[PDB]
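Hi support team,

I'm filing this because I wasn't sure whether my run with A27 finished correctly. The job status page said complete, but I'd like someone to confirm that the output block is well-formed before I use it downstream. Pasting the exact inputs I used:
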Amino acid sequence: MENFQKVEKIGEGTYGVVYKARNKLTGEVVALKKIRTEGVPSTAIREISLLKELNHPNIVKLLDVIHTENKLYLVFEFLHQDLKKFMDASALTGIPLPLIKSYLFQLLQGLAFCHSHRVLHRDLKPQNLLINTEGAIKLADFGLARAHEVVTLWYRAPEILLGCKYYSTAVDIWSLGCIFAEMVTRRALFPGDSEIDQLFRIFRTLGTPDEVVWPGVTSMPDYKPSFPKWARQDFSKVVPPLDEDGRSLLSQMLHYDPNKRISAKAALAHPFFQDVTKPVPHLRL
Ligand SMILES: CCCC(=O)Nc1n[nH]c2cc(-c3ccc(O)cc3)c(-c3ccccc3)cc12
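And here is everything the job wrote out:
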């Protein structure tokens, strides 16, 4: 677009490249996403235009939608750091628990809002979690999933992996749970490098799901009665040194059955959020 100048490449998103851009009329700094051809579908235009009205302080603001000369451009608010880089810069000492807790609470607020409007993230990950100097964390890449680097499977819910074509809101809760454990331990919970490896890593840690813990699991599209039977591991061995309230909350976000899995609304009422404060991060720019 004529009104923008590329300053640098922010990264490579799911639907094309993302650039740091300066506006000419405003002088504002923005995140510009060049989307993906035939002539661009109408259905995708409406789904994207619905996202402009889906505003919350914990959702990266879609400033403008630009469709010009059979190419789509998504203009987003710019944030200085992503959670993947922040976790990398906090590897030596680890993100302090008060800050981990505030980030989780705000992300849950973000999720509770999307889920109230029947909007799923589908691909929550540190990469698409953005942070500012004020202590705010925001959800990015939202609603894009509905409308050749390797895609991370680490945060994928088991029902998606088991072939469920109709994801519920619970997939976002599973993804956020994995991020939470990772923020605590400074290591990915389930670093799978293939769908079966990803699934098998979940099975080794939380036990192989059977009809007992997940009614209707054996009838799922990709479920094989031939899967190995692993016994569950206690959460104290999974996430040390997260306290009992954190472990109990994480456990509820990581429930196999999406119906038994905690909502973003009920999670905000969990005793873990009794002593929630808003610390500011120490970020280097
Ligand atoms: C050093 C720059 C740190 C950074 O990534 N900043 C970003 N500011 N704003 C941003 C907005 C987005 C974004 C991309 C697609 C969407 O549909 C929504 C948002 C991204 C972003 C880029 C790649 C993958 C995921 C998110 C990064 C930033």
